[PDB]
């Protein structure tokens, strides 16, 4: 077991301790700077009915509301559900989204 990453697998810079979050899939405790974080904006009605709601609406000029959700998962759940992948040694250095 040598060192695998320069950040030790987290984003902790000039502090001793950080907050705890609960994984939204399995509910384990994870430090906040380690948890995998994604933000999503979606429509409350699925796009496959997004025009039939609209055509059956009495209010003139209505606009379909949206949902704003920040999903946070642990390492195990992120790998299992394919939010992140295991990468090659060269590829691990890439930070591009």
């Amino acid at each position: 077991m040598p060192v695998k990453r320069r950040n030790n697998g987290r984003s902790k810079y000039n502090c001793g301790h950080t907050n705890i979050v609960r994984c939204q899939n399995c509910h384990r405790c994870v430090p906040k700077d380690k948890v995998i974080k994604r933000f999503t904006i979606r429509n409350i009605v699925d796009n496959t009915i997004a025009d039939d709601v609209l055509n059956a609406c009495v209010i003139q000029g209505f606009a379909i509301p949206k949902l704003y959700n920040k999903v946070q998962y642990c390492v195990s759940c992120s790998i299992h559900n394919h939010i992140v992948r295991v990468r090659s040694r060269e590829d691990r250095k890439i930070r591009t989204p």
Binding site: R22, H27, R28, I44, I49, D52, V53, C57, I64, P65
Partner: protein
């Protein structure tokens, strides 16, 4: 032209479709996804929800209601925030039953700071 309110509870394990008046104090028709099925695992599915909504339509047309505002919620609390499978199926079975649509809104209960959810600090080890 005669507005009521539809509360759709789209949860993990079951669905509720519930119509009340504009204040919420008086109900006009209430069905669930689990009154249309035999398998416990099919209560939160789209097909049970649609067959339950089709009988809600029958109840609430005969009582004179013609339009509904929609308030759709997930489980909330400290649990899931995403809707169950039958959520949009109820809205589709409502659009294709003659009901006209007014205002839409998410009514999931979200805390401003919370108590501790079940599971322990290692999670559900499956």
């Amino acid at each position: 032209e005669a507005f009521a309110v539809c509360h759709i509870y789209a949860g993990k394990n079951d669905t509720f479709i519930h119509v009340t008046d504009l204040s919420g104090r008086e109900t006009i028709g209430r069905v669930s996804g689990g009154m249309k099925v035999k398998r416990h695992c099919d209560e939160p599915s789209a097909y049970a929800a649609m067959q339950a909504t089709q009988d809600l339509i029958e109840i609430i047309t005969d009582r004179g209601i013609t339009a509904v505002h929609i308030k759709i919620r997930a489980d909330g609390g400290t649990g899931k925030r995403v809707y169950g499978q039958g959520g949009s199926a109820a809205i589709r079975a409502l659009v294709r039953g003659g009901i006209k649509i007014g205002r839409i809104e998410d009514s999931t209960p979200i805390p401003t700071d919370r108590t501790r959810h079940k599971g322990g600090r290692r999670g559900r080890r499956l």
